[PDB]
Each structure stands twice: as structure tokens, then as C-alpha cells.
Design a protein around this nucleic acid. Structure first.
Lengths: 97, 47, 82, 64
RNA sequence: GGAUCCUGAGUACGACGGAGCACGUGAAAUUCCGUCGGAAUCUGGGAGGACCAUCUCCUAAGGCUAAAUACUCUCUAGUGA
RNA sequence: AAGCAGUAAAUGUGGAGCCGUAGCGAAAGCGAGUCUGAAUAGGGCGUUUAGUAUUUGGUCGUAGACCCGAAACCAGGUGAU
RNA sequence: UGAGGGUAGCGGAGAAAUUCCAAUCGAACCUGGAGAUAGCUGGUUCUCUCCGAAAUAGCUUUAGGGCUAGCCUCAAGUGAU
RNA sequence: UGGGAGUCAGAACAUGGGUGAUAAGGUCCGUGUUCGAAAGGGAAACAGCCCAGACCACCAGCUAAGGUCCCAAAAUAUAUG
RNA sequence: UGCUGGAAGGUUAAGAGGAGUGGUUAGCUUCUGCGAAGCUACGAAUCGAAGCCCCAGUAAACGGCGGCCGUAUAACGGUCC
RNA sequence: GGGAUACUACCCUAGCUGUGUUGGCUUUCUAACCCGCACCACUUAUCGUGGUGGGAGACAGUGUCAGGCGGGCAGUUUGACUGGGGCGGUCGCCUCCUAAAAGGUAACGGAGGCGCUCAAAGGUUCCCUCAGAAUGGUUGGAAAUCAUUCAUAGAGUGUAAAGGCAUAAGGGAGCUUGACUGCGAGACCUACAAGUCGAGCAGGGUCGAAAGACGGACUUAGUGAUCCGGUGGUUCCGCAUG
């Protein structure tokens, strides 16, 4: 309050809404996988244990910023474009659940 | 001297606005101008 | 107090801050303003746009040169030497 | 107890990357017949809160 | 098996107006109120927060119910940077 | 964290849960890109490590909230010695 | 003029006058809400050092109140800016 | 950059201007200065004028504004009128 | 104006007449209406109490009991209202 | 001619009878229901009770719903500025002067405009170029119209004043429709809200042979958030899925 001069929050208009089931997942980028081996199957509950993930949010999803140093295979929900790209660049693949 | 909010040929909503008068310009006017679904200056008409 | 009566003429305009904003030798931006006027007191010359309200801008970045324009008028000549 | 939040203001702005707050403009949502094109373009935008009002309001938003 | 049978009537439900239910006769779909009306009885019905399809859960209108909680006029004993 | 062993303690036990580690966009979505979309452009937001838990101090906020002090309003009662 | 009775506060009474209804009334007194409220006055408890203002915009059902700006202070950073 | 504030009644002089009556120790703006928030000396006393800022001593000295017959420190000084 | 009264010329609730109907969909045709007899529910031709106009009356009701030229309905003729 | 008799909604001009059965309106009954309605008595309680007869009577009243009145009642409001309140006034924008040669700035201080207008007064090519003055003459109230020569834009420019203007931004001829979509670094303003000018970029067209040049009028004013409501489209979502 400012002594009657209009609050900003009625000077300005309400907008927008919430897609109430907003879905982004337990996310993970790339380079964290360097802890693992080559060829090793890297799975959801594995990574839960491994502690790159603390819990599932709405599933899992990936992003390609890091660098892998590990040809190997995954079982995931979701992927970026670069994601499976750079899996199979070294090789290995993505049993996309 | 009053307003005119025009309906395009097929651009399908309420975009363009101008001034005219029903005394100097008593009838429905129309002329060329750029609409977006076309990439060109097409004709549009009064409603 | 007592009867003081109807009363009118206290009417004036919330002003505008006109004139210049930059000066001789000074270096500028692309959408930079150089002057706020009305009419033409000065005349855009080199690399100078003129917006609607007789506002002038320099089309480029660079430095300024005011100077005479006619025999008795004045202009601008922006140069982007660097 | 717990603070509460200005729900009406929650309905009115978006938080940013660092800490800032992205506001929807105003002078909209009605007639633009009396208006111009550059205006309708530059109002189809969104801007930021200023630190001044931010000081005014900082304790309002614990929960964004 | 259930083929047949009993399955909670002025009830359910609706209109009106009032509250409550975070939420405005409301969405109040849910639940009560008072005035008018006013149902099926499975082979049917109820819901699924505008709302319905399909789908699903249940099968209303009959009753009883410890434990896990609450406060201290108490009493006892004790404690008090 | 609740909760539990414990003893009006610690400690231990206790992972439901909370924050962060990717952002963009009302949203659908996408992702070091995203939004707008016509490109990335274009610019906004980004982008390009370090934060976390407890505590001290300051400040703010809700609770009378530095202290005293009205006129008055309401509810229920007393009074015609 | 007495002794006994009857009228109650949004009310009573009233040869009317805001006049009376326990030394007081333009609607009493007791308690309670209630630490009612108070942009209003007053008040606010030992020391030394260092820095050190303002009384101006501007919008206000606002003018002796407020809000930011302004001008202070403190520590983080920068670096001649 | 960010943390914590108070200030919104200002006053007088010079100065500029308006207004008023080339009124007002007026009134409104402005440019300076002092007080407020700053003691000391000078103007007899004399918040704003002149000189001028105190860290504490000290029976030391030099000067400023101003002053030099007595109260009261300093020239009855010179020379001129 | 208020009060009463009235032709009531007509205009006027809670009242009726009924031609026809969501979101989703069992319904007449597998590009398609009898709205019938279907969940969060519905239409007009028309009239329609109190009244609303219209007209009377209405001054020990309220009210006015006026005004101009010549004139401090304080005279008069022109006088208006 | 005044509508208008094929069928004819139905028909005043109707007639007539009540029919699945019922109430249209008014009556008669009366139980209902009532009766501060009189006699009998429990109860010497005549209260109440219940007979009695009489009344009225399906009426109102009563419950809900509805709508007209309602200082009878109750709670609120009843702006500020102000050389005290005060009546008067004024309260939102634009031009100038005060304003002190950057800008900026007061006064219940001085003067003036505004709550729009131009589809041509706009856009774009190609022409024109002053009123006015005298000069002077059918006109003539000198002057109109016309004409000679100078006139400073004194012309004039849609909207007050200001600057500015013959690049004409003034005036015409023709063309038309940029009074275009999606953007823009950037800069001004300012406390905030806001507000203001843009290179240019795609794009794409008008006119123009083009060159290119047009993102509304020479500038400035033309009412004002937001919520709410409405409307149409709709990368959206929208509930177990649809």
C-alpha cells in the first residue's frame, strides 16, 4: 500500500493459466554417465540407487550437454534428439520404455 | 468522422481499424493492403 | 474566509524535455537520439534519420558534427571514423 | 505462522532464471481502435519488475 | 447357481428460496433447511465438481461400534538458569 | 519430518517429505537451447556449478506486538427507597 | 401528604421543559467483548568512538499521514570510470 | 550491487523575480550562505549578520574579524587635513 | 400537491395457453430429427390483482392570496400571470 | 368498391344440447372450518371442555412465494484545494510568459486551445507558386472577377499558440490505397505506472519507366487503468478415456 496511489498489482492484468498436470520428469544430462562402464545396462532403478536421481517426478527425461566416454545401453522413458544420437554415436542404444 | 473495424477477405478475425465518415464516405469502402496468410497486398472490404 | 469568487486562469501544460541529448565530439549508438525538436531548427545531414516528430537520430554509430547547413542554417554530419 | 501470499498477484507475474519477475503489460484487454500499430506490437511483449517495487513487495513472494 | 424372489418411499429427484461444504441456490454435482410437487423397485439404480458417451466404482434410502484423541475442578508425587 | 529405543537427556533409530543439480514457453511442447515464430536471425530468457543443514545478528511479516490514554458501538444484567 | 403497589432504558414518564427515571442523561449504572480503536498528544532507563542528513520532487478521499525517487550509513564488487 | 534508515511545517541574510501598495521581520519560486545539527571572538545585549570549526591537556607564542582615554587589553601613537 | 372519488378508455405479479428444445449421447435413416416417451433442464397467439395514465372534486387540508407602464391589488387606468 | 363467401381458421350476424368430465358465475346447502355466539352441563374451574341450537362458511385467516408502498424504522455518506475555515470557484490533457541564453521550476499567477477531423486535407508521380499592396479599371459600397509591377511567405496551410515551411509541409493534375504483416539493435523520458522516436530486417506490394519512395495528416491535444461483462476465432488445455 502506498496511500491510495494504485498498487502495481491492480495496475497490471492477470493472465495465463496452469496446465495443471505439467509434465517434466526426473531429468538428467549426459556427462554424469561417465561414472558407469561401457556396455553396462543403465536402468531407472539402477540410477535411483546410484543417486544421479533422488526420485521419479513424472518418469525420466534426458538432455545432451555433457560428454559420455561410455558406449552402453539404457532403458528410459524419454530422450532428446541429441540424446539417442550420442548414445549410438559411441554405440549402445536405448530400450525406450 | 467515426470508426471502421474491417473484416478481411479470408484472414478470418478482427485486426484492422481506421477512420472514415458516413457523410464523406457514406458507403462501404475497400482497398489494397498486406494480410498475413498470403504474403502480398490483397484487397479487403468493409462489413 | 468570506466571499472569494469564481476563478479561472491557472491552465498550463505538463511540459516536455526537448532540445539536445548529446554533443560535439561525442560518440553514439545506432538508435541513438541526437535531438528532440519541433519543426526544423536544424537539418539532418549525413547518416541521420528524422522520425515523425522532427526527432533526429543517427542512422549509424559514430561521432557528430554540427555545422552550418545553408548560408544561415544548421545541420548535422555524423561520422563513424574509427 | 506461515506467511501467506498475494494470490491476486500470483495470478499476475512469472519468476525468472535468476530471481527476477516477468510482468505482463497493461493498457490492453479492450479497445485498440484509438491506438497505433507500433504500440500494439510493443505491448505484445512482457517486461520486468523494477527493484523499487521489488523492495516494496519482496516479502510478498516466498513461494515462487 | 442365481433362473424366480427381498433388498430400506412421499423416499430418491425436481422447482422455489436460505446456509454450509476452502468455494456465493449456488455447478453445490455433495449435504441440510422450509413451500410446492414427485421416482424405479436389478430384468434396476447411483455417482464419477458444467457436465455426459464409453468406461469404470458401488447397490441408497435400517441400526451398533474399542483403540489409537481432548481438557483438568481433581488427587498423589515430583520438577523448576 | 512425524514417529520409535531412551529418561521431561543426549545419542541412536526414523527418508514420508524439502531444496539444489537446465532453462524456455500462458499452454501443448522443446531443451543449452527455448519462446516468438521465418531462421539460431532477432532479441527476451538463457547457456556457460555449488550449493546445502543448523545457528548468531539485522530487518520484515501474523499474533494487543515499544507503553499509557477517548469520546463511542454491541451483548447480558441492576435500578422508580 | 402518607403507608402499600405498577411502569425499564431502541425504553419509561411527561399541564413539554433534551425535562426526570438514586447528588449525573440528547437515552443511566454494573459487568463482558476489550490490552475495542487512535494516521492522534505525552512518554520511552549506562557509557566511548567513526560517519552523518533532510524540511525537495511525484501520485494519492491526500495534504501536520503514506509511497517510492532524492539525499545517509554498512559491507561485497568494480576500478580511474 | 545489495542490508538498515530518518527526512516531506523549514527560518533568516545577500541576490534574482513574481504578487502585494517599486507595503510588511509578508507571500511563491530561484541562485548562494548560515542555523536547524556548530560551540568560540565581534556587533552592549543580539539562532541566521562579520571572523571562524574544539581530540585532551598547559599561567607559552602568532594572527583574524574587529580595536587601541576609564569602566576594559592594547597607540591621549605619528603626519595630514 | 396531498387526500378522497370516478369513467375505469386503455395500458399491468404471483396465472394460464404450448406450437418446440444442452455437455454427452441408447433414440429415424450408418453423411442423419415426431423430438419425441430420456442424466448437471425448456418456448408464444393472447389476455392477466394491487395499480398506471385520464376526469372530477380538493384551500377551520397543505399551499399561495402574485407581477409590470405610469405606482412609499402601500391608489388607480394599460395591465400580464 | 370497404374487406371479402373454393378449403375455409371460425364467424357477431347465432341457434341448441351436455356429452372422457370438469369446473368458468352466482346461488342453496352444510358438515369442513370459524363464531370476544346465546342455552346445557364437568367445574361451586361460568377458564378449558364438550353437547345445544344459531352464525357465517368453503370464505377468509393462516404457511410459503410474489410483487407495490413504507424517515415508521435502522445503518452509512455528505470530495478536497483554500493567506482560518467560508460562498464562490476550480480538479483531466495541449501552446506560450512568468523561467533568470543548456534543460528543468511556483504562485485562488498571466493569456489561449481540447474532449476532433481529412478515403482525401491521406499515399504516390508531374505541374504551379505568394497573398496583400498599390497599379484600376463594367465591377465599383476603393475593392468583387479580371489586369501591370513589387511584395516574405506578411500568402496560406482542417482543428488555439508556437516554432517552423516555397526540400514547399502551400495549391493543383493523374494515379491510387504504406491509414501493410512479423520484427529490430538502439535511444529519450521519467520514481513507478507509463509514454516517445527508430536505423534497419524479412516480407511484400501502391505509384512511378524507374531512381526508388510510402509503416496515416508540418509537430503537439482528442476522452482513461484494471476488474467485470460481451463477442468471434483458437498450435492450447479442459478431469477414467473420448
Amino acid at each position: 500500500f502506498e496511500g491510495g496511489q494504485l498498487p502495481l498489482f491492480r495496475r497490471l492484468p492477470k493472465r495465463g493459466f496452469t496446465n495443471i498436470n505439467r509434465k517434466e520428469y526426473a531429468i538428467v544430462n549426459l556427462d554424469q554417465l561417465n561414472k558407469f562402464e561401457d556396455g553396462t545396462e543403465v536402468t531407472p532403478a539402477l540410477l535411483v540407487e546410484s543417486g544421479v536421481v533422488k526420485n521419479e517426478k513424472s518418469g525420466i527425461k534426458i538432455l545432451g550437454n555433457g560428454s559420455l566416454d561410455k558406449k552402453l545401453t539404457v532403458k528410459a522413458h524419454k530422450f532428446s534428439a541429441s540424446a539417442a544420437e550420442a548414445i549410438d554415436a559411441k554405440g549402445g542404444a536405448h530400450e525406450v520404455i | 468522422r467515426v470508426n471502421v473495424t474491417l473484416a478481411c477477405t479470408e484472414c478470418g478475425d478482427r485486426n484492422y481499424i481506421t477512420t472514415k465518415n458516413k457523410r464523406n464516405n457514406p458507403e462501404r469502402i475497400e482497398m489494397k493492403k498486406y494480410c498475413p496468410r498470403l504474403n502480398k497486398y490483397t484487397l479487403h472490404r468493409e462489413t | 474566509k468570506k466571499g472569494v469568487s469564481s476563478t479561472k486562469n491557472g491552465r498550463d501544460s505538463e511540459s516536455k524535455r526537448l532540445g539536445a541529448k548529446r554533443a560535439d565530439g561525442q560518440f553514439v549508438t545506432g538508435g541513438s537520439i541526437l535531438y528532440r525538436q519541433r519543426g526544423t531548427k536544424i537539418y539532418p545531414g549525413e547518416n541521420v534519420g528524422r522520425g515523425g516528430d522532427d526527432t533526429l537520430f543517427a542512422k549509424i554509430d559514430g561521432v557528430v558534427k554540427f555545422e552550418r547547413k545553408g548560408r544561415d542554417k544548421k545541420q548535422v554530419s555524423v561520422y563513424a571514423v574509427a | 505462522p506461515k506467511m501467506k501470499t498475494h494470490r491476486g498477484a500470483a495470478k499476475r507475474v512469472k519468476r525468472t532464471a535468476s530471481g527476477q519477475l516477468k510482468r505482463s503489460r497493461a493498457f490492453t484487454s479492450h479497445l485498440f481502435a484509438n491506438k497505433s500499430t507500433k504500440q500494439k506490437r510493443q505491448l505484445r511483449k512482457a517486461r520486468l519488475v523494477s527493484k523499487s517495487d521489488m523492495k516494496r513487495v519482496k516479502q510478498l513472494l516466498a513461494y515462487k
